[PDB]
């Protein structure tokens, strides 16, 4: 089973055939770090970590599973909120802030007891958004509910119809108002393959 | 930009082939049976700092394996000589492009991690953090010198330029 964070914190803080072979998988750790970056509506995110006995390498060991209509609805909410924020309010951040000769900052002394700021959240009026009000900004929403998600592995989902109506209403910016495939006429994959094979160019299509 | 994005989508749709059947693959399940690895639960920013300092330590070990004393790697991943080189010292400084490629990948990773470290200290707003993360993945080619090390990487920048325009 697991282990408390203070041990691995001491391991990384205080620190060769067994040590040299563990550094082979470093870009794999880079990939596992970068695919689990927290969303703009989250403040913190806890992840499991595999680590060597001497602190050689650290992985994130988790696949970022989301529910797709919830994900599109959350990004549409962020889209509306960021449009509102730019029409209301701008200082872009100064890149790389930490200088070349100083080491990266210690987590245990500077972030560990400092409470974070507020995230980016929409208001979610409690009358119309009532099916989605209790779970719309969690990390993995509805994970511990047996009625919607099959279990802790968080693989399958099924919702009710007012929930789908609300998530379709909130995501109206990232979606199209199309109804039928009378659109994309001579502008779909097979017409593009035909223009590829005949070496001609559709107006608006690729070359 | 529309025509180039649609061109890359047509190429990905045309070159699609089903993957080969195989035995199912699990790396960390093999790592867990090894007693040399342990498991815990941490915060994302803490492990994001541990990963970049471990990458700095790995590149520093790869520098000091061949008994090199005249090179210096910054904490923000910049490699500079300390003096003017000679003939034999340039022959002893012949690393592959994979070295500088992993160096620029760790540089990109340290930019992405420290953008969050600056946020959780209360310095910038999340409204400004969302701009800052959007500038990095759009301007990898301007913030890093990673385009010099792989030329096919020129495909990856312009697509991120094209999505820069539309949005």
């Amino acid at each position: 089973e697991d282990m408390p964070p203070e041990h691995v914190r001491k391991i990384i803080r205080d620190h060769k055939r067994v040590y040299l072979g563990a550094l082979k998988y470093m870009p794999h750790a880079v990939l596992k770090l970068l695919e689990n970056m927290p969303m703009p509506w989250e403040q913190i995110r806890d992840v499991p970590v595999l680590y060597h006995i001497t602190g050689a390498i650290s992985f994130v060991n988790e696949i970022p599973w989301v529910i797709e209509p919830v994900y599109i609805s959350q990004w549409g909410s962020m889209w509306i909120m960021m449009r509102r924020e730019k029409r209301d309010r701008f200082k872009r951040m100064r890149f790389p802030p930490f200088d070349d000769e100083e080491p990266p900052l210690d987590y245990a002394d500077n972030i560990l007891d400092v409470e974070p700021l507020e995230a980016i959240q929409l208001e979610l009026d409690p009358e119309e958004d009532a099916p989605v009000l209790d779970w719309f900004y969690d990390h993995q929403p509805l994970r511990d509910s047996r009625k919607y998600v099959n279990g802790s592995t968080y693989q399958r989902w099924q919702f009710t119809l007012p929930m789908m109506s609300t998530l379709y209403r909130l995501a109206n910016q990232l979606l199209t108002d199309l109804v039928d495939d009378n659109y994309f006429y001579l502008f779909d994959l097979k017409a593009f393959f035909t223009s590829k094979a005949l070496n001609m160019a559709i107006p608006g299509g690729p070359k | 930009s529309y025509q180039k994005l649609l061109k890359y989508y047509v190429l990905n749709a045309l070159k699609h082939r089903p993957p080969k059947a195989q035995k199912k693959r699990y790396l960390f399940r093999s790592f867990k049976a090894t007693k040399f690895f342990q498991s815990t639960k941490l915060d994302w920013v803490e492990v994001g700092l541990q990963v970049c300092r471990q990458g700095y330590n790995m590149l520093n070990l790869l520098i000091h394996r061949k008994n090199l004393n005249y090179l210096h790697l910054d904490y923000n991943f910049n490699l500079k000589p300390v003096k003017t080189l000679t003939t034999k010292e340039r022959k002893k400084s012949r690393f592959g492009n994979a070295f500088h490629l992993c160096r620029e990948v760790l540089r990109l990773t340290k930019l992405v991690v420290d953008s969050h470290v600056q946020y959780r200290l209360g310095n910038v707003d999340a409204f400004q953090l969302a701009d800052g993360l959007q500038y990095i993945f759009a301007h990898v080619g301007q913030l890093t010198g990673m385009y010099r090390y792989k030329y096919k990487l020129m495909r990856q920048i312009r697509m991120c330029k094209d999505l820069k325009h539309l949005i």
């Binding site: 072979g21 | 035995k23 693959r25 790396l27 093999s30 790592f31 090894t34």
Partner: peptide, 23 residues
């Protein structure tokens, strides 16, 4: 000596995914 044997056994387990097909 044992640690290199452990990493070689893990590498042989990684190569076991395609062992009868590749050779």
């Amino acid at each position: 000596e044992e640690a290199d044997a452990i990493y070689a056994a893990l590498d042989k387990r990684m190569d076991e995914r395609r062992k009868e097909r590749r050779e």
